[PDB]
mmCIF file with all atom_site columns, C-alpha atoms in Angstrom:
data_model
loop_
_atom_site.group_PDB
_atom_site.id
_atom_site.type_symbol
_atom_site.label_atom_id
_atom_site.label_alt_id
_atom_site.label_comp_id
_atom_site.label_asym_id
_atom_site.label_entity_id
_atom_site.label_seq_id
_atom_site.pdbx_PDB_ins_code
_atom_site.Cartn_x
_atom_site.Cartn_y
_atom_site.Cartn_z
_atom_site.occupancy
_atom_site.B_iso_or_equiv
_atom_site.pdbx_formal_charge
_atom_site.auth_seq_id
_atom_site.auth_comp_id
_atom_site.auth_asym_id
_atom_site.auth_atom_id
_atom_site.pdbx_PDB_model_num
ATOM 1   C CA . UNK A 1 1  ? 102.179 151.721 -19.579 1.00 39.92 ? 212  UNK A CA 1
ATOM 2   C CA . UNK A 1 2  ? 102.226 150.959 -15.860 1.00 41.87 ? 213  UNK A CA 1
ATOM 3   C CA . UNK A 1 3  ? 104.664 148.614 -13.816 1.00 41.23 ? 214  UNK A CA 1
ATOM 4   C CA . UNK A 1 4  ? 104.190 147.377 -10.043 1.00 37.94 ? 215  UNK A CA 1
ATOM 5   C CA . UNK A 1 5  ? 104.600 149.791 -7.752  1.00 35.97 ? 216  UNK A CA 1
ATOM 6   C CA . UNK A 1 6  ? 107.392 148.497 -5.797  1.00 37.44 ? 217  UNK A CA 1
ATOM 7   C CA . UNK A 1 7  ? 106.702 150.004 -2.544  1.00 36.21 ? 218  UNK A CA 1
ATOM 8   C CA . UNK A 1 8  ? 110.081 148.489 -1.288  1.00 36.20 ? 219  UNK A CA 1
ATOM 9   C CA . UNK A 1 9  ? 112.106 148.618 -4.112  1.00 34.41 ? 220  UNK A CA 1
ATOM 10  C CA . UNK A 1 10 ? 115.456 146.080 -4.983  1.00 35.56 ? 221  UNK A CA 1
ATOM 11  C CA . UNK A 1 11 ? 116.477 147.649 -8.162  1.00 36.77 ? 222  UNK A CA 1
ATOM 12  C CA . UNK A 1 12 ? 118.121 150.228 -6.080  1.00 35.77 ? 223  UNK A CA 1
ATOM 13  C CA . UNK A 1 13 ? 120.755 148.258 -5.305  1.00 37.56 ? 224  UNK A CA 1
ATOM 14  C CA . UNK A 1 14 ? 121.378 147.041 -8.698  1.00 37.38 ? 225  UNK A CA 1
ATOM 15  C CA . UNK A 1 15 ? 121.259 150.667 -9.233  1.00 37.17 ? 226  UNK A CA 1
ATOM 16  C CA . UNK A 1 16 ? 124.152 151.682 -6.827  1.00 37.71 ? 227  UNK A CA 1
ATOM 17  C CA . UNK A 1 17 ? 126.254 148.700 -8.069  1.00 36.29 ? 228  UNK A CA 1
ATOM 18  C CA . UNK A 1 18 ? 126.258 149.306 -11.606 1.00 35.16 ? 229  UNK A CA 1
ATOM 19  C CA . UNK A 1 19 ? 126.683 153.306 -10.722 1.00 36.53 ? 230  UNK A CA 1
ATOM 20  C CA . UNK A 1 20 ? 129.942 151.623 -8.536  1.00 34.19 ? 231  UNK A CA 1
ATOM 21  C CA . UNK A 1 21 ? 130.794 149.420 -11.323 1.00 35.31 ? 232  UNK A CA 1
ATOM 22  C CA . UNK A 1 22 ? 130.887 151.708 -14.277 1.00 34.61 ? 233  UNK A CA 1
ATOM 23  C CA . UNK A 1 23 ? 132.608 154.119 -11.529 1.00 37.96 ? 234  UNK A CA 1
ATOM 24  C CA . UNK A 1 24 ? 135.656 152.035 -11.249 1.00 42.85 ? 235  UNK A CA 1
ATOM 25  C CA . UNK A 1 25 ? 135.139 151.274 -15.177 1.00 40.75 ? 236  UNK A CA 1
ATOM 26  C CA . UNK A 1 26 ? 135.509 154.555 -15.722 1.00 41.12 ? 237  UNK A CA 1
ATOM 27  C CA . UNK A 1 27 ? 138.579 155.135 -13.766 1.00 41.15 ? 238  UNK A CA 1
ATOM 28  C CA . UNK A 1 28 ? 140.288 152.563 -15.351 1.00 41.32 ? 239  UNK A CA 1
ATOM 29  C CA . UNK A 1 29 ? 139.443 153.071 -18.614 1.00 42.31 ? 240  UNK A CA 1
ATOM 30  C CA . UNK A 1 30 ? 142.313 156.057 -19.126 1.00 42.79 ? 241  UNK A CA 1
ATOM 31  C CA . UNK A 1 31 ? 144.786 153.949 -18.643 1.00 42.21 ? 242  UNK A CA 1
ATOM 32  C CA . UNK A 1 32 ? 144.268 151.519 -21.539 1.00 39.73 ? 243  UNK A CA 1
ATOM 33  C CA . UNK A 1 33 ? 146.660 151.455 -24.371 1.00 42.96 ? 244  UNK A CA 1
ATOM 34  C CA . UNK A 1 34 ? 150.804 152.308 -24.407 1.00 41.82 ? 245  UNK A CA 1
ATOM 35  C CA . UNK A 1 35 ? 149.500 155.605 -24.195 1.00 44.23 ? 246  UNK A CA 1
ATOM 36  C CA . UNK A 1 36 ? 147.220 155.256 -21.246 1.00 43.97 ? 247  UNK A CA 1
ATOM 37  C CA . UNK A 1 37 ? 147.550 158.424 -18.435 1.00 44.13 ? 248  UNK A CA 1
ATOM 38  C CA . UNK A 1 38 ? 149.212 157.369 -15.189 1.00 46.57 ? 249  UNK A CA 1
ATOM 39  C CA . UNK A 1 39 ? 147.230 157.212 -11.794 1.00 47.27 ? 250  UNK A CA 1
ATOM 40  C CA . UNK A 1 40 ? 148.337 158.324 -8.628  1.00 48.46 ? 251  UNK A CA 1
ATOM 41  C CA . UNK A 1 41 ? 147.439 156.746 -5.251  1.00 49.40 ? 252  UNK A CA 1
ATOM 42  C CA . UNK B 2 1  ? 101.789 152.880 -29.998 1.00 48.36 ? 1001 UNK B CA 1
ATOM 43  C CA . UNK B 2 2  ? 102.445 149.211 -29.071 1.00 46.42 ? 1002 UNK B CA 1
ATOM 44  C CA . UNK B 2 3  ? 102.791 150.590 -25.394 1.00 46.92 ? 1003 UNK B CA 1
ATOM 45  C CA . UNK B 2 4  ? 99.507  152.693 -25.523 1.00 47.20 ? 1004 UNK B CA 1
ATOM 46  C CA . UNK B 2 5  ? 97.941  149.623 -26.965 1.00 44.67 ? 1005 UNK B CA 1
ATOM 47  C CA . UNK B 2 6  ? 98.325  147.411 -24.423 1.00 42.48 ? 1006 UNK B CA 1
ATOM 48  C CA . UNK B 2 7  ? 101.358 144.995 -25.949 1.00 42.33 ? 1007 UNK B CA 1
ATOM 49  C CA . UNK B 2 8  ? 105.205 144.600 -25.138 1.00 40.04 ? 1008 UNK B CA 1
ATOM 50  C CA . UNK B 2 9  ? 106.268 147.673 -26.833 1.00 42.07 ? 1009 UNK B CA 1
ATOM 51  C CA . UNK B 2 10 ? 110.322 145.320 -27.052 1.00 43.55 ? 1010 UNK B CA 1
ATOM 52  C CA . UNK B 2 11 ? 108.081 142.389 -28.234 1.00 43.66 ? 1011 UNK B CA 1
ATOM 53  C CA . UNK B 2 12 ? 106.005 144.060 -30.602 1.00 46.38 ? 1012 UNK B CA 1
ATOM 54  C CA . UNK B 2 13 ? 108.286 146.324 -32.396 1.00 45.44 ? 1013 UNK B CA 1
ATOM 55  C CA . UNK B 2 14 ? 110.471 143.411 -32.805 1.00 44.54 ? 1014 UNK B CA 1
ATOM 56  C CA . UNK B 2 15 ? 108.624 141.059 -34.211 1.00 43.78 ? 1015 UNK B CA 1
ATOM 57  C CA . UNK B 2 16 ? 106.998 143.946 -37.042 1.00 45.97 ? 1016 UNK B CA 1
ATOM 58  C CA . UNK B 2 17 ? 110.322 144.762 -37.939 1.00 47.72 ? 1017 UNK B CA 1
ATOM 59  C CA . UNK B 2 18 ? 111.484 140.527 -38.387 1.00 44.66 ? 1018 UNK B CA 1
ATOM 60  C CA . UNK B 2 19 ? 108.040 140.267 -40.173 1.00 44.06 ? 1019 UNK B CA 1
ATOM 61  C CA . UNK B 2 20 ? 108.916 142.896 -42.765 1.00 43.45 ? 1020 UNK B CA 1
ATOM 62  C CA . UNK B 2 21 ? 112.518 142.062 -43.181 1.00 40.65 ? 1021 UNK B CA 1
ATOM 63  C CA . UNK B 2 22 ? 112.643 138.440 -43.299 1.00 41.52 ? 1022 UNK B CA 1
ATOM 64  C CA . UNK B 2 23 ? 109.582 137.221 -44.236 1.00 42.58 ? 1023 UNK B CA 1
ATOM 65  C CA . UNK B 2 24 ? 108.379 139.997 -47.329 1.00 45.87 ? 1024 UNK B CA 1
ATOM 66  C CA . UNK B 2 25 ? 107.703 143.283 -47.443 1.00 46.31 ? 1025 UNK B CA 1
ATOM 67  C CA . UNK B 2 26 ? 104.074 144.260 -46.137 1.00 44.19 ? 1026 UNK B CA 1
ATOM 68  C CA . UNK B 2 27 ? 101.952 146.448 -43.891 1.00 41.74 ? 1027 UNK B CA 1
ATOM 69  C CA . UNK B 2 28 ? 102.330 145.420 -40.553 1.00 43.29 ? 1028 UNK B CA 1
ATOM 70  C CA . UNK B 2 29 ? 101.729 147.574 -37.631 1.00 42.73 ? 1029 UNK B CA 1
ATOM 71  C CA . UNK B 2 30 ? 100.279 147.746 -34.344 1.00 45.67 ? 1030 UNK B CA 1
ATOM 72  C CA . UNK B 2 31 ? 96.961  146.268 -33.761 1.00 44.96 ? 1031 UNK B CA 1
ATOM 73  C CA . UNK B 2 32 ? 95.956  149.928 -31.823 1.00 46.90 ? 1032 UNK B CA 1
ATOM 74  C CA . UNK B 2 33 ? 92.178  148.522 -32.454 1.00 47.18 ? 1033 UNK B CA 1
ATOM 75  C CA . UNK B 2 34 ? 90.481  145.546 -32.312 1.00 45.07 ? 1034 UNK B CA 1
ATOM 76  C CA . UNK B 2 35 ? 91.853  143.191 -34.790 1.00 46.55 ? 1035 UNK B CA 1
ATOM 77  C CA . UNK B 2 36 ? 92.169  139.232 -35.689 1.00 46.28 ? 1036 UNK B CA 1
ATOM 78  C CA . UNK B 2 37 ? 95.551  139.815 -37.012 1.00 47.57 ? 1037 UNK B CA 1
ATOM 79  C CA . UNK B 2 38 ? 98.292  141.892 -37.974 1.00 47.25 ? 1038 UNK B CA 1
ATOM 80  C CA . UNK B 2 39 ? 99.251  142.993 -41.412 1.00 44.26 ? 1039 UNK B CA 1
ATOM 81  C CA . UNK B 2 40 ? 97.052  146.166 -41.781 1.00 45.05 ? 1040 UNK B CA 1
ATOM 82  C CA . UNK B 2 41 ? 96.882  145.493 -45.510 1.00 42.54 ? 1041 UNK B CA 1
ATOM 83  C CA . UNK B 2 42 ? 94.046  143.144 -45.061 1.00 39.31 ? 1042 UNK B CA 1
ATOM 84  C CA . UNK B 2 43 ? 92.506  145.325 -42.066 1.00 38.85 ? 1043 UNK B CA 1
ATOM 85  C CA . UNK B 2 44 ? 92.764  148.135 -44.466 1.00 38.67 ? 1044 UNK B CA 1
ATOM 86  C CA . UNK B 2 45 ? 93.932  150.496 -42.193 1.00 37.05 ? 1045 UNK B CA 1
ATOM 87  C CA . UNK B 2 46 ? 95.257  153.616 -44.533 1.00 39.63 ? 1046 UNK B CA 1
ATOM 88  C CA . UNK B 2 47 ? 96.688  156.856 -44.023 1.00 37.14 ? 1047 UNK B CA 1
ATOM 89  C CA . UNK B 2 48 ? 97.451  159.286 -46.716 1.00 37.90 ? 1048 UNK B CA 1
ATOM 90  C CA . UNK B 2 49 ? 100.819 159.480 -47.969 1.00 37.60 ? 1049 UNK B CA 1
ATOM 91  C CA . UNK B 2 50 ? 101.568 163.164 -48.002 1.00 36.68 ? 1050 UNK B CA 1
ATOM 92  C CA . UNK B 2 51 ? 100.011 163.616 -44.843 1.00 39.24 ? 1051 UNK B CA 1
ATOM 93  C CA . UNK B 2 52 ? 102.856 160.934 -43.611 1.00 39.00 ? 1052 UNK B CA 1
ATOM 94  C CA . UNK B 2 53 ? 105.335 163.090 -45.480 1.00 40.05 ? 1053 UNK B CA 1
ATOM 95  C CA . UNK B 2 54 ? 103.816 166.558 -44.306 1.00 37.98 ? 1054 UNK B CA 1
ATOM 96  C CA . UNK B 2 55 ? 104.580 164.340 -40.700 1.00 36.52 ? 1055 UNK B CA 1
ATOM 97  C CA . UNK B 2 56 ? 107.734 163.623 -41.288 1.00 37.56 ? 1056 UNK B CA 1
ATOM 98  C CA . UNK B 2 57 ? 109.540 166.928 -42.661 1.00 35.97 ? 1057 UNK B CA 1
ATOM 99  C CA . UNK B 2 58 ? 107.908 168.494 -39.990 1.00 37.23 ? 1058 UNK B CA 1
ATOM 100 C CA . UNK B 2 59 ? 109.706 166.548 -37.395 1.00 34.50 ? 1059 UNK B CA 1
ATOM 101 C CA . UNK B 2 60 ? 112.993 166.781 -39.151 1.00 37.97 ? 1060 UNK B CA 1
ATOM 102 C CA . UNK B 2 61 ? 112.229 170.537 -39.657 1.00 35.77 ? 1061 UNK B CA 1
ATOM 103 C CA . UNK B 2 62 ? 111.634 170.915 -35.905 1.00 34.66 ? 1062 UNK B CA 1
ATOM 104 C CA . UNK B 2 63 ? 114.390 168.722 -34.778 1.00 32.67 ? 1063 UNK B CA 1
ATOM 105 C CA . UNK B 2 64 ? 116.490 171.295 -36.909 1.00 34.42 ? 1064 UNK B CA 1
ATOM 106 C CA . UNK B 2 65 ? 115.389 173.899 -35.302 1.00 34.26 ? 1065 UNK B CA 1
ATOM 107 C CA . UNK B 2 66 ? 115.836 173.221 -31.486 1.00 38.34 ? 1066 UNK B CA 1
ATOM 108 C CA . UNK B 2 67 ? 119.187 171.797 -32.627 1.00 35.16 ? 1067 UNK B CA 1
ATOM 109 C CA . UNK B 2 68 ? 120.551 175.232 -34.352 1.00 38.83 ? 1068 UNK B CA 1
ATOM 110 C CA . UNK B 2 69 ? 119.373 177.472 -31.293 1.00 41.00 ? 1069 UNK B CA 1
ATOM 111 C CA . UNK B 2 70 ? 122.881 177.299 -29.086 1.00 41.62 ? 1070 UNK B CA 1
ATOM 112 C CA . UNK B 2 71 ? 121.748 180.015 -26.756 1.00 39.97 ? 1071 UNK B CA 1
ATOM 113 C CA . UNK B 2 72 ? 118.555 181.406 -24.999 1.00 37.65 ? 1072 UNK B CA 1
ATOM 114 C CA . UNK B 2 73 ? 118.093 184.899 -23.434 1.00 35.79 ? 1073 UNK B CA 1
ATOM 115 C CA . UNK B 2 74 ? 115.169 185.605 -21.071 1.00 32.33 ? 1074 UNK B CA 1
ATOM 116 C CA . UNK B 2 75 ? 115.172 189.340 -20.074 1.00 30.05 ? 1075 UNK B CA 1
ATOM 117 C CA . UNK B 2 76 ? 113.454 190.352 -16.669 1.00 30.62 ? 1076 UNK B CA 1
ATOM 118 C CA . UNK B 2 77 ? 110.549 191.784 -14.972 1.00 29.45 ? 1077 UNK B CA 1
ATOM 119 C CA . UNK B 2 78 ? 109.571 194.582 -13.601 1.00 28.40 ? 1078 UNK B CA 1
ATOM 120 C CA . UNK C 3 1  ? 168.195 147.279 -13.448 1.00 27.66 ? 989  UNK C CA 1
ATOM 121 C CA . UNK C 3 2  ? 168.965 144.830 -15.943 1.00 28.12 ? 990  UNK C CA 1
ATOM 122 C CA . UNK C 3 3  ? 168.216 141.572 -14.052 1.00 29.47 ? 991  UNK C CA 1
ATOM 123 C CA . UNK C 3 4  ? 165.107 143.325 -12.617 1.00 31.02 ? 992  UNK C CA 1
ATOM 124 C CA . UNK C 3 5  ? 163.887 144.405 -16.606 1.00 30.73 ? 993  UNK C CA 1
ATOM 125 C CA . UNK C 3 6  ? 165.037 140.972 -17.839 1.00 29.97 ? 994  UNK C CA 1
ATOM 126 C CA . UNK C 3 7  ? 162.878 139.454 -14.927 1.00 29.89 ? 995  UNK C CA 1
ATOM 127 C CA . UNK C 3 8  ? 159.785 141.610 -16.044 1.00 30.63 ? 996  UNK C CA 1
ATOM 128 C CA . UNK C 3 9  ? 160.511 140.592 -19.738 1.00 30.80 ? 997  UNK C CA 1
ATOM 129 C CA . UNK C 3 10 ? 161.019 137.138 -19.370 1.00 29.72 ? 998  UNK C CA 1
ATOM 130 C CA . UNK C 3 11 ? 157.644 137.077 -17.139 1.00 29.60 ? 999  UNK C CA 1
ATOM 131 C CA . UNK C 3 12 ? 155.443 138.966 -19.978 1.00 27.78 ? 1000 UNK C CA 1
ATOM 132 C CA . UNK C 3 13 ? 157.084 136.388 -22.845 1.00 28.17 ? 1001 UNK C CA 1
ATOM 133 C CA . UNK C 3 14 ? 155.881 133.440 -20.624 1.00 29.73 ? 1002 UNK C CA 1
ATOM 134 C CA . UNK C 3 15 ? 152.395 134.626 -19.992 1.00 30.05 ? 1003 UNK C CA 1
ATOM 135 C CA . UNK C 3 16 ? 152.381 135.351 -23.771 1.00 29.04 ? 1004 UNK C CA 1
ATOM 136 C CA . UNK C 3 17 ? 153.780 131.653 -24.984 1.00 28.89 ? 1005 UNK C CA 1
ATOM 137 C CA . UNK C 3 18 ? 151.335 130.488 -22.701 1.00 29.63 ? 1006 UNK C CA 1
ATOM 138 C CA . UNK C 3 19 ? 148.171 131.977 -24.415 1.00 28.78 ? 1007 UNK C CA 1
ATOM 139 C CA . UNK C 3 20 ? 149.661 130.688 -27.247 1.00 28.49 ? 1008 UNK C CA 1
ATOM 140 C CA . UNK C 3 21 ? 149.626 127.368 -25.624 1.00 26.53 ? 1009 UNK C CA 1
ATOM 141 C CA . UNK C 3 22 ? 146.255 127.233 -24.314 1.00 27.25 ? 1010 UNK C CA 1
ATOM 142 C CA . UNK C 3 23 ? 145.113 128.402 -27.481 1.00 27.01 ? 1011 UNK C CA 1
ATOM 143 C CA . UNK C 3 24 ? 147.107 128.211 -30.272 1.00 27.78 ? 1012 UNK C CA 1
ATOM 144 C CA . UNK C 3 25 ? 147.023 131.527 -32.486 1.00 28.64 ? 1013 UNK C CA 1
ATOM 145 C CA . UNK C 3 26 ? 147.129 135.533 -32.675 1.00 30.41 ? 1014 UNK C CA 1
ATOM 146 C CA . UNK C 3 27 ? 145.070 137.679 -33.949 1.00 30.84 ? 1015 UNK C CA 1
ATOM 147 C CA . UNK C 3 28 ? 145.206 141.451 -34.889 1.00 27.70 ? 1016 UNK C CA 1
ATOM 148 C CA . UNK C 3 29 ? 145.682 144.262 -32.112 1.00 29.58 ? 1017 UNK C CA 1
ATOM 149 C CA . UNK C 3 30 ? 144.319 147.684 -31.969 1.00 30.32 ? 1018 UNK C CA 1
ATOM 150 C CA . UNK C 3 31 ? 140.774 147.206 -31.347 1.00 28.60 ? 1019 UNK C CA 1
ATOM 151 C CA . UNK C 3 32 ? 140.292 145.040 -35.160 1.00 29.33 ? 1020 UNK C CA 1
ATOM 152 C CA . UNK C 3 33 ? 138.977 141.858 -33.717 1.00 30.88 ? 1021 UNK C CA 1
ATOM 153 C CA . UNK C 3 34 ? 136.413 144.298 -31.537 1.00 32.40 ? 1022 UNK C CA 1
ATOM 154 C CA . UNK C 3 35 ? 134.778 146.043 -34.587 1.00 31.48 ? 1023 UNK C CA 1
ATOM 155 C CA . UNK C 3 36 ? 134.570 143.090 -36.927 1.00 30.89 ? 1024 UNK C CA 1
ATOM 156 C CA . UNK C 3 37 ? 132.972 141.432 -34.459 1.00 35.44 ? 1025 UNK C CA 1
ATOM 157 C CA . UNK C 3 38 ? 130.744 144.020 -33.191 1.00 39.00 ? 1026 UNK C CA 1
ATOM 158 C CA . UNK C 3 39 ? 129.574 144.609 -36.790 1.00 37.38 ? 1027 UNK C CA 1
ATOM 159 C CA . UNK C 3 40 ? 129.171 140.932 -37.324 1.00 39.50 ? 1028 UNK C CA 1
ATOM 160 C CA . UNK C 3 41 ? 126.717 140.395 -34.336 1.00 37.31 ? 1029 UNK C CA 1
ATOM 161 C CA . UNK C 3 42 ? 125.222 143.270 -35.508 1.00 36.99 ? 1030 UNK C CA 1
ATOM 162 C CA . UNK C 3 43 ? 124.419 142.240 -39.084 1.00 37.49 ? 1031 UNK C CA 1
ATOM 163 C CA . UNK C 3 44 ? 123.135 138.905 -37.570 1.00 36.53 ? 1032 UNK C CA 1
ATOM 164 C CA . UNK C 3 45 ? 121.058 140.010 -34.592 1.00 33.81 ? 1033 UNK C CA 1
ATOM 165 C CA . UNK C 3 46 ? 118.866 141.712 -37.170 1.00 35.03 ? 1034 UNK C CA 1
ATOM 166 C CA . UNK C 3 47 ? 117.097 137.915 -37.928 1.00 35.75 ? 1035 UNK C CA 1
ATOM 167 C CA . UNK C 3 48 ? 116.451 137.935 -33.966 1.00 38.52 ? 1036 UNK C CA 1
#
């Protein structure tokens, strides 16, 4: 099919935040659970 | 085929798969053509069953194969 | 050590009593509630 083209296009930044989002998600994710790694900052 | 056709592929396949759950079990595709209605079994819109079957072993077949190939050599040019 | 782990303790048992308060009830841990509900919504979301 065919969408709109969008010449300036918002869903970029929904993009970058969910790419930031699942990012941090991501990070903290290891550390669920008693057995969770440890992070060092 | 609901998004070659022209409809809400999300839409469509949705509401052929509620249709043949909930409902009863029927012939309902996509209206590719023009049509007054769903429910190909009074559109009459047939296909031959082995062909479907020849269809679908192939895919599995081929799915098989591109799976259970782990490595690919090219050699050069001269 | 031991007031600063009894501190820590004490703090953890209160937040705990106090789910308990808001809501009264437990329910299972290790990820039970999760799949019974996920295959729950699942079973249902087929009449959507």
């Amino acid at each position: 099919n065919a969408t709109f083209k969008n010449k300036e296009k918002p869903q970029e930044v929904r993009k970058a935040n969910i790419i930031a989002a699942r990012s941090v998600a991501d990070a903290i994710r290891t550390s669920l659970g008693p057995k969770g790694m440890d992070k060092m900052i | 085929l609901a998004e070659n056709s022209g409809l809400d592929p999300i839409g469509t396949l949705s509401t052929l798969k509620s249709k043949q759950l909930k409902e009863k079990i029927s012939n309902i595709g996509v209206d590719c053509l023009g049509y007054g209605s769903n429910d190909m079994k009074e559109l009459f819109v047939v296909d031959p069953f082995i062909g479907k079957k020849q269809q679908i072993l192939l895919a599995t077949q081929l799915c098989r194969m591109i799976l259970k190939i782990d490595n690919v050599i090219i050699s050069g040019k001269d | 050590m031991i007031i600063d782990e009894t501190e820590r303790s004490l703090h953890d048992a209160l937040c705990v009593i106090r789910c308990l308060v808001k809501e009264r009830g437990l329910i299972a841990g290790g990820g039970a509630p999760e799949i019974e509900i996920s295959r729950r919504l699942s079973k249902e979301a087929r009449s959507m």
